[model samples]
Target: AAQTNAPWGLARISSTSPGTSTYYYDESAGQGSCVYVIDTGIEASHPEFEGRAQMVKTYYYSSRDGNGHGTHCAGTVGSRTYGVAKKTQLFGVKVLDDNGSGQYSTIIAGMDFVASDKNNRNCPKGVVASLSLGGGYSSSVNSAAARLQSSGVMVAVAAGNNNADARNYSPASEPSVCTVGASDRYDRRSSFSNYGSVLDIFGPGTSILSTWIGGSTRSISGTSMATPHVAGLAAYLMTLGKTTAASACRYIADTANKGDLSNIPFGTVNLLAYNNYQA
Candidate 1:
């Protein structure tokens, strides 16, 4: 089961969990926003999603949740117990295969599919693309992200789990994306999280509990887990008419709790705190 109290990450960011906090905003729930998960794929029929998930695009494999990573990430963005924007339309564009691996071009293809609205016409105002995968730098991937951002879609990418400088990786190194690193319940940087000046924010990634592929829930860890929080929040901001990628990014960065982190080279990072938009 998901944690009853707000996930430490959400509480730290001051975001209220669904059904827990009375303070509410119709738009803050991301009613009119769309979030695209660019990873393995999602179980489109997951009960938590309430029929809100669709496989808008696919590359290197069929549009199926063969691996659980994408489904878990989707839960964090729009599930009953684990989401930040519970009402956001959740879409999946498969890039990685069941092994949780894919070609760089495949990743870019997924982004282009969404940014260009190749299949899913639902993202008329643009979409929030959450990518939890990364590796060595790829200009193709960076360029894709740049185009997505230029089209007004918010792109959130993971700082790889290598525990080194994120500047050495792909989408995280991409300046046009909001790069996210992982934090633990104690507000400490996850030991596996990559850090550096390129990171745009941090969120709970260690032992994060969310929807699994077999209609179950489980805990997993990585900057992968952290990326969706920022993506979901960006979608939430967009629902409030903070539609541009730049404006949503500004709201997040400006409102983030700039606290001292518990580790090196990242002594002070933007700790995500919830904004009571209705308050």
Candidate 2:
């Protein structure tokens, strides 16, 4: 399996330049890795998932999502068509509510469950946490995320969409996790994306298309969208044994397409996430 020629978002990451049409991702190398989507919810029954997506720990024992955010992010992470790691196992940990919002306590609990699940499973491959949800700063949530990474899960989080400093946010500001910013198809910083030194990488997010609720699809945007791309890449690396949780950020940054992005605000890293895919 391969994530071949898709659209703008996928195309952009495979090439160092702005305009490219083919995304050459070899999914065969990522079958054993896992990516945990920590968000509203993911419909495990979506056809795009091809029987790979499933729901796990929930905020209230319900896994249904009125908001399409989680599914969209999950799809981008590993769906057959719009995904980065097409063969990785996809799991949903519902922390956010249908409104795409949740309490800090619930969010921390979600990370706790992910850590426990990974430790309990016979997982020899790497695990990744794709955090597409965040609010104001929370030390508790940040600590929980760090502990999850400490438990051998690579955490990729969205910098806020506030267009301000990402250091003002939690989890994104957490030094142990990889904070991601958003970039457009043209290699420009997404206008609404947060910046500053907190970010460790960038991914395509503007008007990006991905899976939605009810076995459908939708094009959405945000650092929320970009975070999954990083998660997927991290899963790919973990599957290949190219990274551990402690070295993932450095490897992703060191091997990214550096200094090629435009409109990068002060203090933000100029490295764009790549899946080792080339034409």
Candidate 3:
């Protein structure tokens, strides 16, 4: 994570860097008209979020920031920016609660809320769901997550920060979801990022500045932060009619940057070209 030194007037675009915002928005045309973020309840009063984000719903499962991780996650995904999608509506589902560790049932219930909202004509629906949390992967989880993907809602999840083993997990493992991993300034896999062929894409996640508990600021690292950037990108892409989870994913993968990055080690994965597509 780069020092958000210029934090006052900066935008992180799809990842966490002053230059990164330009890497996509300026090149890829512009931010998607709207996006949804699933994390801790956003600080509804934050000045940065005034016109850029709105909360259509919130589900508090935990007590409240067992450690403030949820708030930080939400801010990273939808914080204000001069060029960022500052006006996109954000959906905050606080499954983690104040404690930050939610039970499986709680998680399921939150997602269910989103699914239900889509069917209700009056609710503010999500074009894409930014899921920054992940745990063990299960067939049941995939099936449940797939519902959103099938219904034309794009889902993106973190690849997890654990280096214990690279095997994918939870929502990230679901084939229907966009799985995101972490990378460093040079685009190298972050030391803490989990790796596997299933890792759909990587974004700068080494060290990131995000909102924290009690309205404090902190620099943390992990794929958790990286996931939302892709989620925002998904929303950006959906505007082009890459509408479904699968189609928008294919577009991102197909148009990824593919030049000197080709020699970087892992098999070729799209990155740069994605920012240039018309739709």
Report the number of the highest-lDDT candidate: 2
- Rank order by TM-score, top first? 2, 1, 3
lDDT of 3: 0.57
TM-score for every candidate vs. truth? 0.89, 0.96, 0.77
Candidate 2, poorest ten consecutive residues by summed lDDT:
1-10
User: In candidate 1, what are the lDDT values of residues 1-279, reduced to their tens digit?
Assistant: 123475555554454332242323344477778898998999988899998888877875489989999999999888867787878899888899999998987887777788777344564444688999998987887888888877768889999999899888998888878889888776678899998888878877887878899899888999999888888888877777765666666668777766645774634355554554644
For model 2, how does the per-residue alpha-carbon lDDT over 16-119 read when each residue is reduced to its tens digit? 67787767766564688888999998999999999989887787658887789999999999998888888888888999989888889889989999999986
Number of the candidate with higher lDDT, 1 or 3: 1
Which should have the higher lDDT, number 2 or number 3?
2
lDDT of 3 by residue, 129-245 (tens): 777777887666667678867766777778787853335488767777777777655556667776665667765566666676675667777888777666666655554444445
The per-residue C-alpha lDDT of model 2 at residue 174 equals 92
Q: Give per-residue lDDT, candidate 1, residue 26.
A: 46
Model 1 scores worst on lDDT over the 10 consecutive residues at: 16-25
Compute the lDDT of residue 42 as modeled in candidate 3.
58
Tell me how many clashing residue pairs each candidate has. Answer: 5, 0, 18
Per-candidate Cα lDDT values, in order, are: 0.78, 0.86, 0.57
**Model with the higher TM-score, candidate 2 or 3:** 2
Weakest 10 consecutive residues of candidate 3 by summed lDDT? 1-10
